[PDB]
Each structure stands twice: as structure tokens, then as C-alpha cells.
Amino acid sequence: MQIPASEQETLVRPKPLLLKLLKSVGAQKDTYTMKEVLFYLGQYIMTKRLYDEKQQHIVYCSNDLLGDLFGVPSFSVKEHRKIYTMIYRNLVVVN
Amino acid sequence: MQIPASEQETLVRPKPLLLKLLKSVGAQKDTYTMKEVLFYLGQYIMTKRLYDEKQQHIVYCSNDLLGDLFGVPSFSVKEHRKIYTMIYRNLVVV
Ligand SMILES: O=C(O)CCC(=O)NCCCCCCOC(=O)c1[nH]c2cc(Cl)ccc2c1-c1c(-c2ccc(F)cc2)ncn1Cc1ccc(Cl)cc1
Numbered sequence: 001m002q003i004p005a006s007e008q009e010t011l012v013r014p015k016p017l018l019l020k021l022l023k024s025v026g027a028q029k030d031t032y033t034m035k036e037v038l039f040y041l042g043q044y045i046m047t048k049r050l051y052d053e054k055q056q057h058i059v060y061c062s063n064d065l066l067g068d069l070f071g072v073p074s075f076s077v078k079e080h081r082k083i084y085t086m087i088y089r090n091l092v093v094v095n
Numbered sequence: 096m097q098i099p100a101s102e103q104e105t106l107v108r109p110k111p112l113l114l115k116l117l118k119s120v121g122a123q124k125d126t127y128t129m130k131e132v133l134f135y136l137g138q139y140i141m142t143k144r145l146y147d148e149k150q151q152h153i154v155y156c157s158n159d160l161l162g163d164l165f166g167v168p169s170f171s172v173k174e175h176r177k178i179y180t181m182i183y184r185n186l187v188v189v
């Protein structure tokens with residue numbers, strides 16, 4: 001829908017901060033598709049209860065490792081392109 | 096398109112180094128669309144002749160401000176998503 005599936009399969013190498021965050025949620029590899037990165041980020045957000053209890057599509061990442069990476073205090077999980085961009089800033093795409 | 100049309104219109108604010116570079120090929124503003132940033136980078140690459148004479152789609156940015164911004168010694172200009180990624184690290188989205 002919002003992101004083409006070919007792009008979701010884009011092979012990527014998270015920078016150290018992002019990678020540590022993925023590892024804290026059980027990620028084992030140093031390379032991932034963007035889909036895998038997103039799944040693991042969903043896991044982190046949910047386990048740390050970063051979503052707002054009342055408005056569960058709003059993630060409050062301020063004062064969390066995630067907000068340091070994304071550089072915003074909050075975001076909507078409905079804006080896929082913005083999220084992809086914030087993630088792209090924290091990785092290298094692989095050849 | 097490997098880059099959707101609307102991603103090209105994304106409003107962005109270059110960080111100081113990338114903005115120095117854009118200004119060096121005539122950039123007047125402090126915020127831009129991604130399309131405009133690419134254009135100015137294209138002119139930078141062409142004016143400094145960072146493309147390979149033999150393989151004109153390959154850019155050798157090693158040992159140049161560009162390569163320091165991009166974090167690679169070379170890249171192909173057909174790798175659009177890589178390129179947008181390398182640029183995005185050097186700016187803030189508005
Ligand atoms: O009842 C309703 O009204 C809504 C119920 C509903 O529609 N959906 C339930 C949600 C499915 C969630 C499981 C799969 O989601 C993900 O893996 C996922 N990963 C993310 C990473 C980031 Cl940085 C942000 C959000 C999500 C997220 C998720 C979430 C989510 C929300 C809160 C939370 F704590 C964790 C995940 N909701 C939808 N999604 C899907 C999605 C996938 C990719 C992108 Cl770019 C954006 C969204």
C-alpha cells in the first residue's frame with residue numbers, strides 16, 4: 001500500500017545504535033530487510049509501552065533510545081514513509 | 096521509479112557540511128526539496144568530474160567532501176535508494 005513491497009525487501013545494515021536496539025529485542029543478524037527492521041522496532045515499541053495507552057497509533061519516543069535515533073518526540077504509526085525515512089537515517093543500504 | 100514521486104518533493108534542511116557543498120555550486124536557500132538537493136549534487140559531481148570517464152555512471156567520491164558525507168568511496172548513480180539514504184543522513188526533514 002503506502003510502501004512498495006520491493007522496497008520493504010531492501011537489504012540494510014543498521015548503524016550501531018539502531019543495531020543495539022534491535023539486539024535488545026532478540027535480533028541476531030548484522031543485516032536485515034527493511035521488513036525485519038520494522039518488525040523488531042514494533043516489538044521494542046510494544047515491550048517498552050512507548051505507544052500511548054489512549055491513542056495507540058501514537059508512539060512517544062522522547063527520552064528513549066528510539067527518540068534519539070528518530071529525532072522526534074512522537075510520531076504516528078500510520079505515516080509509513082516518514083518512518084522509513086527516520087529509519088533510513090540510521091543505516092546503510094547494502095550493494 | 097525506485098523513488099516515488101512524492102518522496103522527491105520531501106522538504107529537507109541540509110546539515111552544515113552538505114549545505115556548504117550545495118552553496119559551492121550556487122545554492123541560495125537553507126531548505127529544499129530532495130529533488131533540488133539531488134540536482135545540486137549532480138552539478139557538484141559533474142563540475143568536479145567525480146564520475147568515471149570510462150564508466151560515467153560510477154561516481155568516485157573517495158577523498159572528497161562528498162565521500163565524507165556519503166560514507167562510501169564510490170557508488171553507482173543507478174542505485175537511487177542508496178543515494179537517497181546517504182543524503183538523508185546529512186539533513187533533517189522539515
Ligand atoms: O483496532 C484498531 O483500530 C487497530 C488495530 C490494527 O490495525 N492493527 C494492529 C497492529 C499490527 C501490529 C503488528 C505489526 O506491526 C509492526 O511490526 C510494526 N513495526 C513498527 C515499527 C515502527 Cl518504528 C512503528 C510502527 C510499527 C508497527 C505497527 C504498529 C504498532 C503500534 C504500536 C506498537 F506498540 C507497536 C506496533 N501498528 C501498525 N504497525 C504496522 C506498521 C508497519 C510498518 C510501518 Cl513503517 C508502520 C506501521
Ligand SMILES: O=C(O)CCC(=O)NCCCCCCOC(=O)c1[nH]c2cc(Cl)ccc2c1-c1c(-c2ccc(F)cc2)ncn1Cc1ccc(Cl)cc1
Pocket residue numbers: 133134135136137138140141145146151152172173174175176178179
Ligand atoms: O545512455 C547513456 O549513455 C547515459 C545517458 C543518460 O541517461 N544521461 C542522463 C544524465 C542526466 C543528468 C541530469 C540529471 O541528473 C541529476 O541531476 C543528478 N543528480 C545526482 C545526484 C547524485 Cl548524488 C548522483 C547522481 C545524480 C544525477 C544523475 C546523473 C549523473 C551522473 C554523473 C554525473 F557526473 C552527474 C550526474 N546521471 C543521472 N542522474 C539522475 C539521478 C537523479 C537522482 C538519483 Cl538518486 C540518481 C540519479
